[PDB]
Amino acid sequence: MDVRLAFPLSRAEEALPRLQALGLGAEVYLDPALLEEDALFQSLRRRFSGKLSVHLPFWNLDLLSPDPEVRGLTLRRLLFGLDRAAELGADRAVFHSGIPHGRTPEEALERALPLAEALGLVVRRARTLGVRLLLENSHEPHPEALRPVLEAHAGELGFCFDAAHARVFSRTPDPGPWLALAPEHLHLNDTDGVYDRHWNLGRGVLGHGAWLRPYLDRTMVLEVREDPEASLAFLQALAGE
Ligand SMILES: [Zn+2]
Ligand SMILES: [Zn+2]
Ligand SMILES: [Zn+2]
């Protein structure tokens, strides 16, 4: 199994020893404040070899923001993040759609093709660099608003499924409709069904045993804020039956 630990670049020193010890890959979140810090990228690239992907910046970003300066910043953040991903030898880079929380299905759907268009330069940059670009669900109420973005890009854009985001932020809490988008990348954790807890698998309400087994051959990222061993042990028991 390709199982990776999520951590911010800002906590790499702290997460690396634990990665080694558990034989995990990495998905590194590119702290916007740290994007220009050449030495941190050099240090990481030397100190880790093993499968690596990145989470592109996302906080307060949206390619379709009504604020033109936010749109500009968002584009710069995604493109620079992709440069850094390539430097770290990342296979994949994950990003959010930028959709605000609480849009209606109609509002989310209307953003789909404008988003596909706005992603033109980002998809092109990823292609040039040899980095696979993945869109993750966040606040979309239903997977139908992501489907046209994927289709417009005709296989050049992949999907990362985060089940907790569907459960706590969307109007489609069941994993089924989201799984129908064929995620190649899974963001794994558990939640109480109220907050995006980033707890270990087995600790919450998502019932991964009921739906996750078919996806164990895909890249899985433990997006867990506590020690991730319990999730790795969950995955291993799931894999053995
Ligand atoms: Zn994410
Ligand atoms: Zn996620
Ligand atoms: Zn989350």
For the chain, give the secondary structure using H, E and C: CCEEEEEEHHHHHHHHHHHHHHCCEEEEECCHHHCCCHHHHHHHHHHCCCCEEEECCCCCCCCCCCCHHHHHHHHHHHHHHHHHHHHCCCCEEEEECCCCCCCCHHHHHHCHHHHHHHCHHHHHHHHHHCCEEEEECCCCCCHHHCHHHHHHCCCCCEEEEEHHHHHHHCCCCCCHHHHCCCCCEEEECECCCCCCCCECCCCCCCCHHHCCHHHCCCEEEECCCCCCHHHHHHHHHHHHC
How far apart (Å, rounded) are the C-alpha atoms in residues 187 and 122? 22
How far apart (Å, rounded) are the C-alpha atoms in residues 9 and 203? 26
When computed from its CA atoms, the radius of gyration of the chain, rounded to whole angstroms, is: 17
Is 96 known to sit in a ligand binding site? Answer: yes
Q: How was this structure determined?
A: X-ray
Task: Indicate which ligand has the atom closest to the C-alpha of 135.
Answer: 1
Residue 8 phi, psi (nearest 5): -70, 150
How far apart (Å, rounded) are the C-alpha atoms in residues 135 and 159? 5
Task: Indicate which ligand has the atom closest to the C-alpha of 225.
Answer: 3
Strand partners, 135: 95, 159
Burial 174-187 (b: 16+ CB within 10 A, else e): ebeebbebebebbb
Neighbours of 114 (CB within 10 A): 12
Strand partners, 161: 186
How far apart (Å, rounded) are the C-alpha atoms in residues 77 and 164? 25
Non-local CB neighbours of 186 within 8 Å, separated by 6+ positions: 160, 161, 162, 163, 212, 215, 218, 219, 220, 221
Residue 38 buriedness (CB in 10 A; 0-12 / 13-18 / 19+): exposed
Strand partners, 136: 96, 160
Is 139 known to sit in a ligand binding site? Answer: no
CA of 18 to the centre of ligand 2 (A): 20
- Least Cα distance to 93 among 130, 55, 127 occurs for 55
Residues with CB under 5 A from ligand 1 (ion): 136
Neighbours of 218 (CB within 10 A): 16
Is 67 known to sit in a ligand binding site? Answer: no
Neighbours of 115 (CB within 10 A): 22
Non-local CB neighbours of 86 within 8 Å, separated by 6+ positions: 129, 130, 131
Hey, what amino acid is at 238? Answer: L
How far apart (Å, rounded) are the C-alpha atoms in residues 154 and 158? 10
CA of 36 to the centre of ligand 2 (A): 24
- Least Cα distance to 142 among 185, 97, 205, 196 occurs for 97
Is 196 known to sit in a ligand binding site? Answer: yes
Chain centroid offset of residue 140 CA:
14
Is 187 known to sit in a ligand binding site? Answer: yes
Answer yes or no: are the C-beta atoms of 107 and 144 closer than 8 Å.
no
CA of 189 to the centre of ligand 3 (A): 8
How far apart (Å, rounded) are the C-alpha atoms in residues 176 and 77? 32
Structure tokens at 147: 């489907």
Domain 1-241, CATH homologous superfamily name and number: Divalent-metal-dependent TIM barrel enzymes (3.20.20.150)
Neighbours of 58 (CB within 10 A): 21
